Amino acid sequence: MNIFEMLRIDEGLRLKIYKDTEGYYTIGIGHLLTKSPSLNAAKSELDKAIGRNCNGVITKDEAEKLFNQDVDAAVRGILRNAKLKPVYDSLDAVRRCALINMVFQMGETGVAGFTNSLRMLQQKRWDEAAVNLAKSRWYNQTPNRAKRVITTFRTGGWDAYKNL
At 93, which amino acid appears?
A
Residue ranges making up the domain that contains 140? 1-164
CA distance 66 to 149: 22
3-state secondary structure of 19: strand
Domain count, the chain: 1
Q: What's the alpha-carbon Rg for the chain, to the nearest Å?
A: 16
CA distance 88 to 121: 9
114 assigned binding-site residue: no
Sign of CA dihedral 68, 72, 78, 81: negative
Give the experimental resolution in Å.
1.7
CA distance 72 to 100: 10
CA distance 148 to 151: 5
Q: How many other CB atoms sit within 10 Å of the CB of residue 106?
A: 16
The DSSP line for 25-92 is: EEEETTEEEESSS-HHHHHHHHHHHHTS--TTB--HHHHHHHHHHHHHHHHHHHHH-TTTHHHHHHS-
104 assigned binding-site residue: yes
* Technique used to solve these coordinates: X-ray
4 assigned binding-site residue: no
CA distance 95 to 31: 23
User: What residues are labeled active site?
Assistant: 11, 20
At 48, which amino acid appears?
K
CA distance 20 to 153: 25
Helical pair 143-155 and 126-133, crossing angle rounded to 10 deg: 170
Task: Note whether 27 and 65 are within 8 A (CB).
Answer: no
Q: What phi, psi does 15 have (nearest 5°)? A: -95, -5
What's the CATH code of the domain at 101? 1.10.530.40
Cα 129 to Cα 3, 77, 126, distances in angstroms: 21, 22, 5
CA distance 57 to 55: 6
CA distance 91 to 69: 23
CA distance 134 to 7: 20
CA distance 6 to 164: 10
Q: How many other CB atoms sit within 10 Å of the CB of residue 66?
A: 20
132 assigned binding-site residue: yes
